[PDB]
Amino acid sequence: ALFDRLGRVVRANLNDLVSKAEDPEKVLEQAVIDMQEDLVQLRQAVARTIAEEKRTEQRLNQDTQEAKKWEDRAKLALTNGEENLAREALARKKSLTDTAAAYQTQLAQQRTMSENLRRNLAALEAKISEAKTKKNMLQARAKAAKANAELQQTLGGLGTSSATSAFERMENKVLDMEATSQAAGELAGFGIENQFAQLEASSGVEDELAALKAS
Amino acid sequence: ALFDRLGRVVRANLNDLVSKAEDPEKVLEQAVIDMQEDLVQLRQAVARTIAEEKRTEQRLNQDTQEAKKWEDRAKLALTNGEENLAREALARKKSLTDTAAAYQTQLAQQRTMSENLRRNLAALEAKISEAKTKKNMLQARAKAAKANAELQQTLGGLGTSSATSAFERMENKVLDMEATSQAAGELAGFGIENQFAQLEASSGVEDELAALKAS
Amino acid sequence: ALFDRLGRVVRANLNDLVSKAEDPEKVLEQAVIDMQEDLVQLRQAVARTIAEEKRTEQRLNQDTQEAKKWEDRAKLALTNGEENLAREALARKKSLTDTAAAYQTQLAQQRTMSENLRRNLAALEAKISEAKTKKNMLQARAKAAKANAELQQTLGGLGTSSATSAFERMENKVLDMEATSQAAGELAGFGIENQFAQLEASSGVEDELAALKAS
Amino acid sequence: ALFDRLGRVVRANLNDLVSKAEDPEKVLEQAVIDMQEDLVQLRQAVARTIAEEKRTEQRLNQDTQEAKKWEDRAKLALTNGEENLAREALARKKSLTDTAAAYQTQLAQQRTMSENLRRNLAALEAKISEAKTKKNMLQARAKAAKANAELQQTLGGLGTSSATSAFERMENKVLDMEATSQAAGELAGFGIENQFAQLEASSGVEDELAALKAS
Amino acid sequence: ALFDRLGRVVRANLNDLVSKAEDPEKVLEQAVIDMQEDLVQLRQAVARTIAEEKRTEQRLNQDTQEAKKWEDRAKLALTNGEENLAREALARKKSLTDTAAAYQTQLAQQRTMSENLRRNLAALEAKISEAKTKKNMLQARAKAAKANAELQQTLGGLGTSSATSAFERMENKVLDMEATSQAAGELAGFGIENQFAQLEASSGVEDELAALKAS
Amino acid sequence: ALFDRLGRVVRANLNDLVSKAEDPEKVLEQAVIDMQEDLVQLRQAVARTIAEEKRTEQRLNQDTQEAKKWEDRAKLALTNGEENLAREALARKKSLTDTAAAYQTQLAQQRTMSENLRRNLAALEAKISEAKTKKNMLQARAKAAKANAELQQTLGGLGTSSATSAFERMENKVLDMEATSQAAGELAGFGIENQFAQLEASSGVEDELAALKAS
């Protein structure tokens, strides 16, 4: 349906605006806080399982302690003489003794669930801890991305160095053109040729001075 | 008949709505209260049986005590002299004595019913008590079911951790792509090749410094 | 019937709200006040049984005292001379004497009920007194539960100590990173290598000073 | 019923507010005033029993004094001569004499009730008096509880002494750090080593002065 | 029917407007979210199949454990002496043992369905994962399409470079036309011909200077 | 009948309006969607045929498994001793065995229908797939028809180029007519003939200059 495609495109445009606003390193801190809240909720469920194991433990010890009570009352009645009453007390002692087995098995059963949820806690603890160390390395990688952007700004500064160097190269071309214009006027008037003829006569006089030193 | 099948389907749909609304642990408390009301009604029936046994007991003792009365009146009349009157009193004593046997047998008969209903009370007491202990273990099992649902929420939190980790992985891919773009521009301009030639000349100078330390 | 299951579920939801509002230690005081009202009602029933025993006692003494009256009137009539009147007075004395036995047996019968209800009072007194001592220990156990919740708050304070220690660890990492950046710039400029060469020359001068002390 | 549990919880919350407002020593004075009002009401009941004993006493003496009147009238009529009238007066004297016995027994009967209520008064007097002495010791114990709270305030003053001593210890650490900084600069400039060489030369001069005294 | 052709043409025009609004890369993210919702619904159906396998497993173990109960009761009755009761208990043990086979076969039957749906889950997992990797390559291809559009903009910039170069070529044609107009006026006045005659006389003077250097 | 010819002409006029509104490429997408709905309906009929084949398969296996049951019961009765009962069980085993053949033949019969409808599905799958590829080529052909209409617009642009070129040709004819009017006035005044006589005298002077260079 075309309305479902338009709703998916609007949700994708909203997600693209969310990614454009995403903040470096702050998202990792928010993930660590969210993992801490999840660990507190998991610890509450583990605590409720441990409380069930403690309830069954208390009931077990209650059963044992009450069976000893019936056992003592049976001996009291036996010493008095009412033997049938002692047999009745022992009969109730048997009921308590047998119920001890059911609560014992239930207790060992709850130990398996306790260990299961404890293993889940341990693995999720590993997950949160690797989140911690991953953030440690990921903050170093995010700083390295900012340093790579600084290296790109140093390369981009080549455009500004080309503007300053091009302005200096234009001023140097104007100075060299003024010097060339003085040399072109001095050559075109014959003055450079007269100076070359005078330099040849000065070289002839230097050769005559070398011969005068040689003789 | 099709109307009986529609009535059974409507009652099954009503039962499915009742199961959807069922509350954890509260149903076990309502069962313990219903077992207490049933035990009070059973105790009232047992009390009526015990009252029948007490009525017959009183009638038995009445018969014995009245027979002693006739026995004494017979001796009074004997000492006076009216022997026939004493024989009449003894004749009534015989009637009372014989009725004692019928009420004695009826009393021992009612003892069997008393013991029957008492055994029923004892067994139903065992039933209610195992209901109590069963609720004790069943509340621990219901808490373990809530803790299993918490472990499923910790596994389901993997989808939210994949959304946070995927947002971090997209930001890391954008930073690594900016660094790769700076390295691709630096290589494509020949600057990475000029830096590799300068690093080879720096390694040659380090080998010359090692030879200068060696000589 | 589905309406009976909905009524039991609504009553269980009301009981769960009552347990959520339950107040520590105040419920034990309300139980002690309710046991005091029940003991006052039981004491009123015991007092009515003791009053029945006192009524029969008064009737017994009345019978004895009246029999003595008839005995004296018989002697008065005997001394006067109307012997038949004295025999009549003695005849009534016999009736009173015999009724004394019936009221005597009834009195000893009421003593058994008095002792029965008195034993019930004694046992329920034991029950209320163990309620008192149980509250004494139970207030100590409720304070120990509040202290266990304080120990859980001291362990939960580890999250706040991790926030303060993590802020200090981030400030220490920033200071150590600034020191490392100064050391990396000093090494990369060759200044750390020049300082290591000067430290080797200072160690050579210290060895020359040790040789100059040795000679 | 859930409304009875909510009423008991509201009454327990009201009792907890009453205990929070409880005032030391003033409650013992209010108990002494309440015991004085109860003793005044008990004394009024004892006074009504003593007034019943006084009424019977007056009736007894009235009977005796009236019997003497009839006895005198009998002698008057005897001396006159109407012997039958004297016998009639003596006949009434007998009626009064016999009624004296009934009121005598009733008086001795009321003495038993007087002594019973008097014993109750004595025991409740012991109760109020032990309340008095108990308050005497209990005011000493309440003052000892206030003195124990003062000893807890003296121990709690250790936190304020740690704040003052910690401020002094920080100022002493700043002064010792300034002295250490002067000693570290004096050692690092070689001045402490020059002073140690001068102290060795001063010890050599002291040994030369000891040899110059020895020779 | 012509109304069905008009409805198909209107739906095709609506689809063409939907394709014109289609957004690059956002549709792949919406497909990954839709595959995650479908995987959650498939996982719920697989979980219901696994719960059916667990129900049958519990019933199987229940049957075994109950058969052991009947086996023990048979030995109790045998040791007591009621042999027929023991044979009855063994008769019920046989019923439980045989039902174990039916639930065993049903359990192994449900394992086949569990594996079937698990294989479907695995294959659809492969489908979603190839969707993930396909999006990875498809985002690279979409960026390459944007870069191809940038290369088309660089070629289209040839029209703007032709406008700037054509304006410079018109200014250069105007300057060259002004120079040509000065040369055409200088030639048409005979001044270029007089300068060519003077350049021929200057070449004759240069040849005379070369002969004067040669002699 | 003339009313049937008028109804056919009205339906043909409605079809001509439908063809005038026909949209390029969108009709091929609507045909692909209509082929998908037809394939879903055909797949539902094929699924009902496969379910009939599965029903017969289950009945076949039921027959085999039940025949084994009767075979075992026959051996039980044989070992017990009731031989006639075993022969009866084998008699029922024969009935089940023979019914197996009828359901076997019916199953192989339904396989032929399954294969027939499966072949129809395969061929219609070929039809829909060639519809897909035909649309692939047909979208390329529809784009080529739009490009042919663009080539017709480029040829039709020759009319607009003739309007611009005709306006330029009229301006060029007006400029050439103004130049011709200046030349016609200059010729008609004799000035062109005087300039031709002066050009002949200038050619005579150029021939005299060539003779002066030749001598």
Beta strands per DSSP E along F89-213? none
D46 closest CA partner among D126, D110, D129, D132: D110
DSSP line for chain C: -HHHHHHHHHHHHHHHHHHHT--TTHHHHHHHHHHHHHHHHHHHHHHHHHHHHHHHHHHHHHHHHHHHHHHHHHHHHHHHT-HHHHHHHHHHHHHHHHHHHHHHHHHHHHHHHHHHHHHHHHHHHHHHHHHHHHHHHHHHHHHHHHHHHHHHHHHHHHHHHHHHHHHHHHHHHHHHHHHHHHHHHHHHTTHHHHHHHHHHHHHHHHHHHHHHHH-
Cα–Cα distance, E212 to B207 (Å, whole number) = 68
Cβ distance of E12 and F29 shorter than 8 Å: yes
Question: Would you state the structure tokens that stand for residue E151, as one six-digit string?
Answer: 């290369």
**Other C-beta atoms lying within 10 Å of the C-beta of residue C1:** 6
Q: In angstroms, how far is CA D87 from the centroid of its own chain?
A: 72
Q: Which chains contact D through at least 3 pairs of Cβ atoms less than 8 Å apart? A: C
DSSP line for A11-36: HHHHHHHHHHT--TTHHHHHHHHHHH
Q: Name the DSSP class of B18.
A: H
Q: How many degrees, rounded to 5, is the angle at CA F27 between CA F21 and CA F32?
A: 165
Cα–Cα distance, D96 to D60 (Å, whole number) = 10
Three-class SS state of A189: coil
CB-CB: which of A5, A6, A12 is closest to E29? A12
Cβ distance of F18 and E12 shorter than 8 Å: no
D136 closest CA partner among D25, D23, D34, D22: D25
A166 at the E interface (CB within 8 A)? no
| Residues listed for chain A | 215
A2-214 has CATH 3.40.50 classification = no
Name the closest residue on chain A to residue E13, using Cα atoms.
Answer: A2
Cα–Cα distance, A86 to A73 (Å, whole number) = 7
Question: Would you state the structure tokens that stand for residue E7, as one six-digit string?
Answer: 């409805």
Alpha carbons within 13 angstroms on the beta-carbon side of residue F29 total: 15
DSSP line for F172-185: HHHHHHHHHHHHHH
| Sequence-ordered list of residues with C-beta below 8 angstroms from that of B66, at least 6 positions apart, any chain | B96
Q: How many degrees, rounded to 5, is the angle at CA A25 between CA A19 and CA A27?
A: 55
DSSP line for F24-41: TTHHHHHHHHHHHHHHHH
Q: Which chains contact B through at least 3 pairs of Cβ atoms less than 8 Å apart? A: A, C
Looking up tokens 């038995």 gives B60
**Other C-beta atoms lying within 10 Å of the C-beta of residue A209:** 10
Cα–Cα distance, A45 to A146 (Å, whole number) = 42
CB-CB: which of D2, D5, D15 is closest to C29? D15
CB-CB: which of C18, C26, C34 is closest to D16? C26
Chain E residue numbers touching F22 (CB-CB < 8 A): 9
Q: Name the DSSP class of A215.
A: -
Burial label, D124 (beta-carbon count in 10 A; 0-12, 13-18, 19+): middle
Cα–Cα distance, B2 to A210 (Å, whole number) = 146
Contact C124, C42 (CB under 8 A): yes
F117 closest CA partner among F128, F107, F106, F125: F125
Looking up tokens 């008949």 gives B1
The 3-class secondary structure across E56-76, one letter per residue, is: HHHHHHHHHHHHHHHHHHHHH
Looking up tokens 């019997």 gives D67
Cβ distance of B30 and C13 shorter than 8 Å: no
Name the closest residue on chain A to residue B169, using Cα atoms.
Answer: A138
CB-CB: which of E15, E18, E29 is closest to A15? E29
- What resolution in angstroms, rounded to 1 decimal? 7.1
Cα–Cα distances (Å) from E67 to A103, B181, E99, E101, E108, in that order, read: 21, 75, 10, 13, 21
- The torsion angles phi and psi of D82, rounded to 5 degrees, stand at -75, 85
Cα–Cα distance, B66 to B100 (Å, whole number) = 11
| Sequence-ordered list of residues with C-beta below 8 angstroms from that of D106, at least 6 positions apart, any chain | D56
Cα–Cα distance, B137 to B147 (Å, whole number) = 15
Contact A2, E14 (CB under 8 A): yes
Cα–Cα distance, C80 to C91 (Å, whole number) = 18
Q: How many degrees, rounded to 5, is the angle at CA D34 between CA D147 and CA D146?
A: 5
Cβ distance of F30 and E12 shorter than 8 Å: yes
Question: Would you state the structure tokens that stand for residue B18, as one six-digit string?
Answer: 């009742």
Q: How many degrees, rounded to 5, is the angle at CA D169 between CA D168 and CA D174?
A: 100
Q: Which of residues 65-124 of B touch C (CB under 8 A)?
A: none
Radius of gyration (C-alpha) of chain D in whole angstroms: 51
Question: Would you state the structure tokens that stand for residue A183, as one six-digit string?
Answer: 């040399």
Cα–Cα distance, A138 to A132 (Å, whole number) = 10
Q: Which residues of E109-132 are buried (b: 16+ CB within 10 A; e: fewer)?
A: ebeeeeeebeeeeeeeeeeeeebe
Cα–Cα distance, F46 to F123 (Å, whole number) = 14
CA distance F26 to chain E (A): 5
E16 closest CA partner among D206, B92, F24, D38: F24
Tell me, yes or no, whether chains B and A touch by having 3 or more C-beta pairs under 8 A.
yes
- The torsion angles phi and psi of A42, rounded to 5 degrees, stand at -65, -40
C53 closest CA partner among C118, C114, C116, C97: C114
Burial label, D53 (beta-carbon count in 10 A; 0-12, 13-18, 19+): middle
Burial label, A113 (beta-carbon count in 10 A; 0-12, 13-18, 19+): buried
Q: Which amino acid is at B149?
A: A
Sign of CA dihedral F39, F45, F49, F54: positive
One CATH from 3.30.160, 3.40.50, 1.10.287, 2.40.160 for E2-165:
1.10.287
E106 closest CA partner among E67, E58, E66: E58
Question: Would you state the structure tokens that stand for residue F116, as one six-digit string?
Answer: 């027939």
Three-class SS state of F22: coil
Tell me, yes or no, whether chains D and B touch by having 3 or more C-beta pairs under 8 A.
no
Q: How many degrees, rounded to 5, is the angle at CA A13 between CA A8 and CA A19?
A: 125
| Sequence-ordered list of residues with C-beta below 8 angstroms from that of D139, at least 6 positions apart, any chain | D25, D28
The 3-class secondary structure across chain D, one letter per residue, is: CHHHHHHHHHHHHHHHHHHHCCCCCHHHHHHHHHHHHHHHHHHHHHHHHHHHHHHHHHHHHHHHHHHHHHHHHHHHHHHHCCHHHHHHHHHHHHHHHHHHHHHHHHHHHHHHHHHHHHHHHHHHHHHHHHHHHHHHHHHHHHHHHHHHHHHHHHHHHHHHHHHHHHHHHHHHHHHHHHHHHHHHHHHHCCHHHHHHHHHHHHHHHHHHHHHHHHC
Cα–Cα distance, B215 to C23 (Å, whole number) = 93
Q: How many degrees, rounded to 5, is the angle at CA D176 between CA D175 and CA D179?
A: 90
Contact A42, B150 (CB under 8 A): yes
Cα–Cα distances (Å) from D135 to B2, D19, D31, D144, F54, in that order, read: 88, 19, 10, 14, 98
Q: Which of residues 12-41 of A touch E (CB under 8 A)?
A: 12-13, 15-16
Cα–Cα distance, F118 to F53 (Å, whole number) = 13
A63 closest CA partner among A98, A30, A115: A98
Domain range list for chain E = 2-165
B131 closest CA partner among B2, B18, B27, B41: B27
Question: Would you state the structure tokens that stand for residue B158, as one six-digit string?
Answer: 């993997």
Contact D103, D55 (CB under 8 A): no
Three-class SS state of F188: helix
The 3-class secondary structure across A120-174, one letter per residue, is: HHHHHHHHHHHHHHHHHHHHHHHHHHHHHHHHHHHHHHHHHHHHHHHHHHHHHHH
Question: Would you state the structure tokens that stand for residue B94, as one six-digit string?
Answer: 């015989």
DSSP line for B70-87: HHHHHHHHHHHT-HHHHH
Cα–Cα distance, B37 to E110 (Å, whole number) = 44
Cα–Cα distance, F15 to E156 (Å, whole number) = 46
Alpha carbons within 13 angstroms on the beta-carbon side of residue B169 total: 7
Contact A12, E30 (CB under 8 A): yes
Cα–Cα distance, D169 to D176 (Å, whole number) = 10
Contact B142, B25 (CB under 8 A): yes
- The torsion angles phi and psi of C173, rounded to 5 degrees, stand at -65, -35
Q: Which residues of B107-125 are buried (b: 16+ CB within 10 A; e: fewer)?
A: beebeeeeeebeeeeeeee
Cα–Cα distance, A175 to E79 (Å, whole number) = 130
Burial label, C89 (beta-carbon count in 10 A; 0-12, 13-18, 19+): buried
Three-class SS state of F201: helix
Experimental determination technique: cryo-EM
Cα–Cα distance, C207 to A27 (Å, whole number) = 59
E2 at the F interface (CB within 8 A)? yes
CA distance D76 to chain C (A): 30
Name the closest residue on chain E to residue F20, using Cα atoms.
Answer: E6
**Other C-beta atoms lying within 10 Å of the C-beta of residue B97:** 14
CB-CB: which of B141, B170, B178 is closest to A152? B178
DSSP line for A33-95: HHHHHHHHHHHHHHHHHHHHHHHHHHHHHHHHHHHHHHHHHHHHHHHHT-HHHHHHHHHHHHH
Cβ distance of D2 and C23 shorter than 8 Å: no
Q: Which amino acid is at F44?
A: Q
Q: Which amino acid is at A48?
A: R
Could you report how far apart the first and last alpha carbons of chain A are, in Å? 117
E124 closest CA partner among E193, E43, E209: E43
CA distance E206 to chain F (A): 23
Looking up tokens 């693995």 gives A123
DSSP line for B100-127: HHHHHHHHHHHHHHHHHHHHHHHHHHHH
D34 closest CA partner among D127, D110, D107: D127
Question: For B81, left (φ over 0), alpha (ψ -120 to 50), or beta?
Answer: left
Cα–Cα distance, A95 to A88 (Å, whole number) = 11
Contact F32, F132 (CB under 8 A): yes
Question: Would you state the structure tokens that stand for residue D132, as one six-digit string?
Answer: 């008095």
Cβ distance of B178 and A148 shorter than 8 Å: yes
The 3-class secondary structure across chain E, one letter per residue, is: CHHHHHHHHHHHHHHHHHHHCCCCCHHHHHHHHHHHHHHHHHHHHHHHHHHHHHHHHHHHHHHHHHHHHHHHHHHHHHHHCCHHHHHHHHHHHHHHHHHHHHHHHHHHHHHHHHHHHHHHHHHHHHHHHHHHHHHHHHHHHHHHHHHHHHHHHHHHHHHHHHHHHHHHHHHHHHHHHHHHHHHHHHHHCCHHHHHHHHHHHHHHHHHHHHHHHHC
B147 closest CA partner among A42, E50, A124, E44: A42
Cα–Cα distance, B108 to F86 (Å, whole number) = 57
Tell me, yes or no, whether chains E and C touch by having 3 or more C-beta pairs under 8 A.
no
Contacts of B154-161 spanning 24+ positions with Cβ under 8 A: B154/A38, B154/A42, B154/A120, B154/A124, B157/A38, B159/E36, B160/A34, B161/A31, B161/A127
Cα–Cα distance, C198 to C204 (Å, whole number) = 10
- The torsion angles phi and psi of A21, rounded to 5 degrees, stand at -80, 0
